[PDB]
Symmetry: none
Amino acid sequence: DDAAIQQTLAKMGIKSSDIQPAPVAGMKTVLTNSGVLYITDDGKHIIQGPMYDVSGTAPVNVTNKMLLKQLNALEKEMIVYKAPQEKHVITVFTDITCGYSHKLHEQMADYNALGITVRYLAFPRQGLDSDAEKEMKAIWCAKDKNKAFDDVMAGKSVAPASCDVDIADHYALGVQLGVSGTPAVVLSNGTLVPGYQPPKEMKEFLDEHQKMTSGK
Amino acid sequence: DDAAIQQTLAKMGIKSSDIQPAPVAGMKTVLTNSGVLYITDDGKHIIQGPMYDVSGTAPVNVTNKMLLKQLNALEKEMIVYKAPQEKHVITVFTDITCGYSHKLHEQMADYNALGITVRYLAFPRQGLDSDAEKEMKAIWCAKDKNKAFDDVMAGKSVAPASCDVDIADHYALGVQLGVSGTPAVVLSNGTLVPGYQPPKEMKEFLDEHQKMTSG
């Protein structure tokens, strides 16, 4: 009953973003500004979470899964810098006002040459309505996102816009994911790795991570 | 059924402290060495609390309502400062090394004069291997707890004393109840209210809380 669930969140100053049926009967996985909450059908009880599916080899984090669902819907708004021969794919929360994000982009060619595809999402450290947020908003709204981003990091102005992209979505998901500084790397499985890493170290890091992750 | 929940917990190396019912169908409230968790009846899903009953006027921490059993189990290890005309009863996790806990205690009579009974439990912000933990262990083991606590707060001779009171128990219940800094107030309904409040502010707060609850 999405209805009663919302009245409850309302009577608490909590806004819902995505409500999906939870792995447990009578409960729904709710994404809110207060984190992922598990609420009963009648909206009478709220369990903090996270939720783990322990019916198996190792625990499956239901909250992580839900946040990756949101990540999936944002793929259409990510600025993708693909590697000729894609070995790894990482999602980076970046701020065009962050010196380390500058460096990262300035090395985008090396990251790609090493098989690393970088997918950007905006994350204005100074929050919404900040100069950074207002400039990225223009970048993510341009025709060619890759080109617009390149120009701004180059210093060149970009042809602004009024599109359907809302940085707040990126920002809120980043926060939800544990982001706080930039750049922040998010891995395929949802693992967050704050900080900038030079190409060689990044490649080395991702290779080792994939080995450990797959037991090799 | 219980067998399913126990198989799940055993799988993660968790010693079930007790399997109680839950206000949510299909699951049980489970008090464990790791604290309170909610596990479905088939043991397939685990949800870390706390759980809130939000059907009423204000949210209620049902996990804290449940833990109140553990809290009331410590009634004897409490340093109680009874109010002559008891009108409110609050349990406060305090730290004798905390500036704000000292300012609160210093006004104990005022609180007691406003009809508030204060029951103290030990909470060493710095952990189990600390002076705070060592000092409160002595206080809580004293012949006269109230007297001991008063002396220490005033920087007097902290008499040597041992007994079977485990400060870790107070510390664990407080962490589970949501305690972070001291002083932290726990209401008779399990509600945690962090922070210091002078006798007046406090009294008024208790009155408004009580009023806007029972109806």
